[PDB]
Amino acid sequence: FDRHITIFSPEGRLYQVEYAFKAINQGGLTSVAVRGKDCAVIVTQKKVPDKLLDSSTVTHLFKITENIGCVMTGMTADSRSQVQRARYEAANWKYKYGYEIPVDMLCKRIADISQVYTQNAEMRPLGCCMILIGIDEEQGPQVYKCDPAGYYCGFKATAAGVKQTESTSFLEKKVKKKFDWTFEQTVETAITCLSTVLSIDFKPSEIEVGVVTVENPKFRILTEAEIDAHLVALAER
Amino acid sequence: TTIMAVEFDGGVVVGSDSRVSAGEAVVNRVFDKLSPLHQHIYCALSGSAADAQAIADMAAYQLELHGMELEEPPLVLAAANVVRNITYKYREDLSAHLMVAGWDQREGGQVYGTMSGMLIRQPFAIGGSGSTYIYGYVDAAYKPGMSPEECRRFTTNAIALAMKRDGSSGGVIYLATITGAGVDHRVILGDELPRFYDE
Amino acid sequence: TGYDLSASTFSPDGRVFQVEYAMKAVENSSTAIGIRCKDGVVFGVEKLVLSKLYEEGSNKRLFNVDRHVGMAVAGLLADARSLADIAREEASNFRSNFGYNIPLKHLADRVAMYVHAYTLYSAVRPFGCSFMLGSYSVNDGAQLYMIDPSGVSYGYWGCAIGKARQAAKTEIEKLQMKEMTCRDVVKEVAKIIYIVHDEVKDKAFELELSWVGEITNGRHEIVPKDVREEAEKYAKESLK
Amino acid sequence: YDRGVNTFSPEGRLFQVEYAIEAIKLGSTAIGIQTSEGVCLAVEKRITSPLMEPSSIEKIVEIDAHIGCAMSGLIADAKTLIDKARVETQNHWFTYNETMTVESVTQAVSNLALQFGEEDADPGAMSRPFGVALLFGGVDEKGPQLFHMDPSGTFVQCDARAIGSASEGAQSSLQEVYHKSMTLKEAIKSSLIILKQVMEEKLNATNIELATVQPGQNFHMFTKEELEEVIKDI
Amino acid sequence: TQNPMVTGTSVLGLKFEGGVVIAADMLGSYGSLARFRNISRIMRVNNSTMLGASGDYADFQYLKQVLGQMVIDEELLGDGHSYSPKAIHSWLTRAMYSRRSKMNPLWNTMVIGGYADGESFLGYVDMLGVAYEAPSLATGYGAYLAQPLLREVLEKQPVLSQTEARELVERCMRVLYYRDARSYNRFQIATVTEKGVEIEGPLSAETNWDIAHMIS
Amino acid sequence: SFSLTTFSPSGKLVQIEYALAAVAGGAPSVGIKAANGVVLATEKKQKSILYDERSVHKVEPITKHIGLVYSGMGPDYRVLVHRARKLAQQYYLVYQEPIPTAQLVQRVASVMQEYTQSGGVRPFGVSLLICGWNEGRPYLFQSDPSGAYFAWKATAMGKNYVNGKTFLEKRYNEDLELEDAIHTAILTLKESFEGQMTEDNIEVGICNEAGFRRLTPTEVKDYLAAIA
Amino acid sequence: RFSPYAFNGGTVLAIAGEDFSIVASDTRLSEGFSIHTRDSPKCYKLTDKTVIGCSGFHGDCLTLTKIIEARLKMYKHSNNKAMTTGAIAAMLSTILYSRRFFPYYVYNIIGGLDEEGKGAVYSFDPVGSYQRDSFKAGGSASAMLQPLLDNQVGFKNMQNVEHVPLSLDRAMRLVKDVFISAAERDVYTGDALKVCIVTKEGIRGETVPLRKD
Amino acid sequence: NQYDNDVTVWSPQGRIHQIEYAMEAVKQGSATVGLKSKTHAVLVALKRAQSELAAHQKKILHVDNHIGISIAGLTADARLLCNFMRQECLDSRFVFDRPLPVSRLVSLIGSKTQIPTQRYGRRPYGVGLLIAGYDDMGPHIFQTCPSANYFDCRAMSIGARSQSARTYLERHMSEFMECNLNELVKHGLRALRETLPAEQDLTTKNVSIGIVGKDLEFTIYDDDDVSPFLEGLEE
Amino acid sequence: MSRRYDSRTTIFSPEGRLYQVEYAMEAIGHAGTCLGILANDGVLLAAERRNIHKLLDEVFFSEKIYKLNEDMACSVAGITSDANVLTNELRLIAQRYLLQYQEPIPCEQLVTALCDIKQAYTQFGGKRPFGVSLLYIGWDKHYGFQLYQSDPSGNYGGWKATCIGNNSAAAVSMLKQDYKEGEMTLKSALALAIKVLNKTMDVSKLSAEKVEIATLTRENGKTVIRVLKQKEVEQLIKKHEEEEAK
């Protein structure tokens, strides 16, 4: 029965938790987020398969609060369900502890939600993994990722979706050589990471890029005009 | 305790005093009774100071959720009905009375008195234990189409008049001008209170 | 295999087949379409006549969730009327909360969240109905959203639910619907209804049309019989 | 097994309800008769050994002064209904201050027959269907009446009805002996004729119990004295 | 119960041929203070019926949100039915009665007028649940003042036109303003007819102060 | 609401049997109680440089004088963290004193038993190793998902735990100072761990008269020099 | 605070004749010193053979009547027949007791013909005690109506006089004049009269004028 | 196979077999027919006896003064739901003090049958209903299903062998509007004949009817008044 | 609640037995040897220790021996998990006795109180039964020195001498021979238990560590419970090794 409900397998693993990981790749998208010195940037692909489909209503970049950005990789039904509860938990922090929730304590409560789904056989886990960014006034920018199992850890850069190891492999080129991470430079690596693996060369209308900086702590999605300004100038060098 | 708000063309001016006194003794002579529920949405606290601060957080808890779900600033009418239903339902254990005012992209500056559990729209609204004595000035001296400079003085003159007659009102005048381009916060020191007939 | 028995049990490929089978039940429902323009949003539904023994106006397929919010459902009519009152409770509780009419994007979110809640539990079943939600306002404008059985909402210039959908969606793409007015859009809606229905399986039907926009003063209103017959005559000019 | 008590058949009928009627064939035979002069009830004690006392066996119970009852099928489920039927009968007189019509007696008892389920119930909910069949005789403003119920809860007005293991051949025998105006005493004679044929044992005065209700006399159980005078008329 | 504040004022209504007029003052009252001078105390229900009330106006806005959504939910249903003026009068009777058993009664006094299918309906309910039907009705001190004024007319002339009705209302609105300290000058005259409910805007009445010169 | 753990035809619990097999393959963890202190040296291994070592720490204190390490599932451990820490809080509520290690492990191990009985829930997949300091006597305890807690001078847990136990059986004996306890805990850790050993790969912490404290990567590098 | 009850006045009479039963009450509805309306019939027809009067707090008179009418349909649907006059009386006794802690404030009077064709008058109290009598009264004028019916209907305190069973012709004129005398001295009675006579053929209603004061 | 065990589990085609088995439970009951005119409405119910000595069961249940209904399905499932229908109609006169609209009652019937479907462990109600009633808009014939689907109807026939009646209902549908009360009974009893076998046809014992109308409240007829209704009708 | 996941532990066997109950006693059958002896001057309870390792601590008390209250004590054979809850519940029950009756609990009341809890879980609840068998010792004002035995099915009975766990039938066979009812005292029963422990235990080299012995006796109006120190047990080993070989 170990492959139906969540219970210990003969080797002590959980197959329902593993299928929750296989439910992430079923979304058909790939996202990347890089933690910079003064900034944190998320880059994901905007998919509009239908011409009648409204582009303004299809967005993969979510706002948990003012200083925290969000992107969801996984089942779309589970993704928008967790973000609503993530906004219920984030507001419960301020109503209780008084200040804007940090990205670390936010990923912890969200991970604890997935822990209840795992231990209990009544409720199934969600097939979506959340990638959260933000800037803490003490340690600076904070970029975290939470899998459906409940694991989260501090990442210098994140990778999710179809491309994972290959996306991280390009990110290893930048961190091992110790490059300089700035607002533009991190956008230089983020666009190049997704473009080389998928062999596309994304257009400004094909993607959406959220950004947060020390000077601009409010999370904001870049406009196609600005993305184009960050495209041809990126393609310039 | 005196709170005042006046609508004009480009926005609203919501004033309040700094005096908070429980009984006949002043707990704090400098306190801000304007608690932001949003960027342009503010709430003027009055009545019981303990119950008003509890509703202000319960209102902010619901408004931040409604604001993040729409990803746009909530309407002033939305924020007023939140305070009203919390007031009307819980009026058994809550004696507080609040005044909701702000600015939105739809109708612009709006001021909604939530006092006693009802809701109505007004061009200018006043509340608190000191608003009862200022009815004379706000009614006669109110003129349509006043400039932002005249609205700041009209709001200040009436609040400074309440501070004289109301024993529970005093301190410094807090002014908040809520417009489409932002909100300006000003503090009027005791020397800058407009002088009226002294005899 | 036993993996598709309960919605709480994942498939070996990481999917829920119980939600998929609820979507296959929607494909058997009658066709309903809608289109939004600058003037408003136009609704239409194909209401199949099951027998001549049924009174005129029976089995109304045009659902009214809220004063400014129309709805058209294709799927199980049992789960349709269920969610219908539930969507009205959410709009009524909204006005009991915030004191005005819920925007269409905010209403589509709360309803879709209630739909996805039953996909998680194995002690209940997911909805077997899919529907579209139109609305109009002076601050927002014409808006059209569709919610699937999995509880996900997508913004649409136009949408088609029921048996024939992809065929009707391509016919909408062949002409610009934005600059049109609801008077000219209902001419195309009735035109598509006659294209979708032929006599092979089904026998007879009736045209159920609805308008929201400037013509209706921003309020959900059904199309009168006088305009409906005149709108049919505009489609009777062609057929071909 | 691999199903609930609420699971439908491919023909659309509950298995638990079907097996409930099939369990009545293991019960005790009781034959009621409705006549213009009253309602007659007869049942066999079914004594398998002399050590038992016939006084402890009551297969005919009295719901009201003018209302009798009969018993078959499972004994455990009947003692719960016999008490519940009595309480609702007195709740009627406690409310309307009148004798409950036997049709309403069958109505109040039939409500608790199909209430059984598992989910969305209370702790006072029944798991398994009733394995008991009941006969309600009695006299009221409309005269003598004899009713019958099954585990499914359907109650039907019947001129004559038989329950138990022998109900197969007894119900067919009731159509033969019942003609037009046949009286109570004549129905008692025909009752002992059919009952003696269907039983495997010998008909004795203390072997069977006989009770009748009349329009001018309350429901009465014939004692050993009168039972000897009744069997003598055969 | 506890303390409602938000006090109201008197409301008048009467029957005439083919319609009903219901008028009330627009002033809300807090204690002895006249605070809100612009308020709509007359609410429209569908086409053929109309509602007005007194007492606590904060409880009246709650009755707006309850009865209003329930009425709108019928217009959303579109079954072809509309709440009869007796149905609204009946639902308010039990809704106000249900608040007494929970020891939380709402302070209010409501009047339900309407005209449907040639049947002119005017009805009265109360916080205490007293409900009946009369050709002329008033609340507060209007039952003491404006009620006997209309009874004298209905006894002499049971049939009244639309013009005669509005003229008698203004004369009753004129008297109520005189002898009711808590009344107010600005009022709204709303009339339901075969064309539906039509609510006129703010109105006033010419007052005769000559008693000032006759006393002195 | 029906119990998922039942008796096998042999009498053994089937569900907890896989729980003990799960913690047997976790991260290697060792500990030693010698002289006035107890040394806890675990394995934190990151699969890439992008991983921040300061964000997630495997060695966590329960309180000032008590600390705990683990080998097993990640998520089930943080559930143990919250409940064991809240148990120490409800302890300090009633008794207003630091909690003894024997009483702390006892009632926390009872939580592991609750899910071997209550239905619709799986047992914990984490085997806890508890360190504590009370009344001047050091404490080293070992608990598994079965709920039975033991006491050990030195032990090993995680992948290849049998070797770590046999190694400490031979090398470790009495009369070892805290400095030798660290060095010995490193040697037994060199055997189970494979590859290059840095200050980030190992997370070490100790508990002594001054309480349970975690070692900074600076002083860990000093012990990586095979000095003490 | 909140006063849950108020006295609305009014008067209700019931008399049981040999073959008939007569029940009458006024139309006047007034609370305090003010008149709500001059036509507010209290008499309510349950079945053809049964008519129930209600006198007391008006809010409880409306609700309790709707509760009785709801249980009338419960009976008839179940028992396939109408309730007897004695069955309705014993029913409301348990209905009034269900509120025993917060009793309904009302005075109920039930009258009509039984299965034997004889009039049955049933007078109640807010707590639900009941009895059968030839004639009963109720309301504000209840003290006034009782002595007149004792002498005229009951033939009491009269020595050596012929006792004739009640006749319908006299029973009508006795009920009319006791209310004409009631409307004189009762501020809560007048403005109209409604007489409901229940006979073996059927119910026959009547209207009698009274003083408007 | 294993997908018929409960309601909640969907078949690979997206169907619920337990709802199908509930819809086939209604067809195992007696065959009843009903129709409405522009004025009146007539419900013709077929009564069966369990045995020859047993009296005929009652297929007609009185709901409201203007409302009546015929039950086809499991007997006790109708009775618990009849206690629900009557309670809602009593609640209508308990609250609104008006006869409950027949369309609003049937909508409450479906909501009661929607509750068991979406939840595991609770069986749907396996009884079908043919209900009629008169209101301000005239008489209405409504049919319900255990699947919770309910339709508005001019005339319908439910039960076994109902198509031979429905075919009759199609041909005379033009006449059903303009006929009067006496003719509606003639068409109603002749419509019942098609659902009946070729041996036992029409007897006033096992055949009962009911009628609601403009000023005429719903009234049940059994034998005495039904005997002249059968007279003058040739089969 | 999917049906396929329920084993329905309340199913009776065709012979009228419970499967989960029989599998519980089998798990107890693998537990170490534990015995007790009722004697005139006191009660004796001794047991072995199956866990033996050079790195073990065991710096507290006994292993399978617990103290229920001042006047009572118990041993344990079974799963140590279910033993901890039973030990807690027994102490809770014996303390709840002290609430109402404010007296030391009679040894008969405490046994039937836990057994009513054991039966309840096998009756309903769907939870697995308990896999622990318990022995009880103590003194009461009525019956005096007492020795009882409990089974996981909830069945219990009084015993003068008994044994549980491994080598139970072997010790019971020796109790039917050497044990003298109403004659041997606590002192003579101590030498007898050591003799039975050594012969029934096939593992050689019995040491004070490998075995455990606890005594409970009443002296001067106070119940005295003790566990013999390893040196005191070693002294008894020196006594038994002369009376074994020599």
User: What residues does E188 pair with on adjacent strands?
Assistant: E24
Pick from B111, E70, B77: nearest CA to C99: B77
Instruction: Decide: I81 and F148 in contact? Cβ < 8 Å.
Output: yes
Nearest Cα of chain G lies from the Cα of D93 at a distance, in angstroms, of 9
* Spatial CA neighbour of C135 closest among C41, C34, C46, C205: C41
Tokens describing residue G139: 């309301």
Is residue C22 within 8 A of residue C148, CB to CB? The reply is no
For residue E195, give every residue at least 6 positions away whose Cβ sits within 8 Å of its Cβ, in sequence order, or none. none
- Residue F105: Cβ-neighbour burial (10 angstroms; 0-12, 13-18, 19+): buried
Preferred mutation among B68, B71, B77, B81 to probe C, highest tally of C CBs within 10 A: B81
- Tell whether A220 is within 8 A of chain B (Cβ): no
Q: Closest CB to C100: pick one of B69, B77, B105.
A: B77
Nearest residue to A125 via CA among A111, A139, A141:
A111
* Residue in B closest to E39 by C-alpha: B120
Do the chains contact at F15 and A8, CB–CB below 8 Å?
Answer: yes
| Resolution limit, Å | 4.2
Q: For tokens 């309904």, what's the residue?
A: G104
> Which residues are bridge partners to I161 per DSSP?
I37
CB-CB under 8 Å, F18 with A115:
no
Residue A30: strand, helix, or coil: strand
| Residue E1 a catalytic site member | yes
CB F25 within 8 A of CB F159: yes
Burial B10-28 (b: 16+ CB within 10 A, else e): bbbbbbbbbbbbeeeeeee
CB E51 within 8 A of CB E45: yes
Interchain proximity D175–H52, CB inside 8 Å: yes
Torsion of CA I221, I227, I229, I230, to 10 degrees: 150
Q: Chain F contacts of A34, Cβ < 8 Å?
A: none
Check: CB of residue B98 under 8 Å from CB of residue B43.
yes
SS3 readout for D209-220: EEEEECCCCCCE
Subunits touching E (CB < 8 Å, at least 3 pairs)?
B, C, G, H
DSSP string, F22-50: HHTTS--EEEEEETTEEEEEEE---SSTT
* Superfamily covering domain D2-234: Aminohydrolase, N-terminal nucleophile (Ntn) domain (3.60.20.10)
* Chain I hits for C5, Cβ within 8 Å: 2
Q: Give the count of domains, chain H.
A: 1
Domains of chain F: 1-227 (3.60.20.10)
Considering only CB atoms, C98 lies closest to which of B82, B105, B106, namely: B82
Q: Quick check: C123 contacting I, CB < 8 Å? A: yes
Domain of residue G2, residue span:
1-213
CA distances from F6 to A48, E195, G172, I6, I175 (A): 52, 77, 86, 10, 35
Hey, of A73, A124, A128, A129, which one would you mutate to test binding to chain C, going by the most C CBs within 10 A of its CB?
A124
Query: Exposed e or buried b for every residue in I54-93, given b needs 16+ CB within 10 A?
Result: eeeeeeeebbbbbbbbebbbbbbbbbbbbbbbbbeebbeb
Burial class (CB in 10 A: 0-12, 13-18, 19+), A216: middle
Separation between Cα atoms, residue G71 and residue G87, nearest integer Å: 12
Determine whether the interchain pair C95/E65 forms a contact, defined as Cβ–Cβ distance below 8 Å. yes
List of domains in chain A: 1-237 (3.60.20.10)
The Cα-based distances of I146 to G165, I74, I102, I141 in angstroms read: 92, 11, 20, 11
Q: How far apart are CA G90 and CA G68, in angstroms?
A: 12
How many angstroms away from the CA of I128 is the closest CA of chain F?
6
Which of C152, C157, C159 has its CB closest to that of A76?
A: C152
Give the chains touching G; criterion: ≥3 Cβ pairs < 8 Å.
Answer: D, E, H
Structure tokens at F70: 């683990």
Alpha-carbon distance of I156 to I148, in angstroms, equals 7
E-state strands within chain A: 30-35, 39-45, 61-63, 69-74, 128-132, 135-136, 140-141, 144-146, 152-154, 157-161, 207-213, 220-221
Instruction: Report the distance separating Cα G92 and Cα G68, nearest Å.
Output: 7
**Strand, coil or helix: I136:** strand
Residue G6 in tokens: 């108020």
User: In terms of residues, how long is chain C?
Assistant: 240
**Contact with chain G for residue H62, Cβ under 8 A:** yes
By what method was this entry solved?
cryo-EM
Q: Can you say whether the dihedral through the CA atoms of C217, C218, C222, C227 is positive or negative?
A: positive
G93 neighbors G65 (Cβ within 8 angstroms) = no
Residue H88 lies in domain: 1-235
Residue corresponding to tokens 């013709």: H44
Domain that holds residue B77: 1-199
CA distance C193 to C239: 10
| Closest-approach residue (CA) in chain F for A13 | F22
**How many domains is chain G built from?**
1
Torsion, CA G132, CA G138, CA G144, CA G145, rounded to 10: -50
The amino acid present at B47, given as its one-letter code, is G
For residues H94 and G67, is the Cβ–Cβ distance under 8 A?
yes
What is the interface size between C and H, counted as CB pairs within 8 Å?
93
Which residue bears the tokens 């047992």?
F123
Q: What is the Cα–Cα distance from A206 to A224, expressed in whole angstroms?
A: 9
Distance between CA atoms of B112 and B99, rounded to whole angstroms?
6
User: Who contacts G23 (Cβ-Cβ below 8 Å, separation ≥6)?
Assistant: G12, G13, G14, G15, G43, G51, G53, G109, G111, G112, G195, G196, G197, G198
Q: Which domains does chain I have, with CATH numbers?
A: 2-246 (3.60.20.10)
In this complex, the chains that touch I, judged by 3 or more CB pairs closer than 8 A, are C, D, F
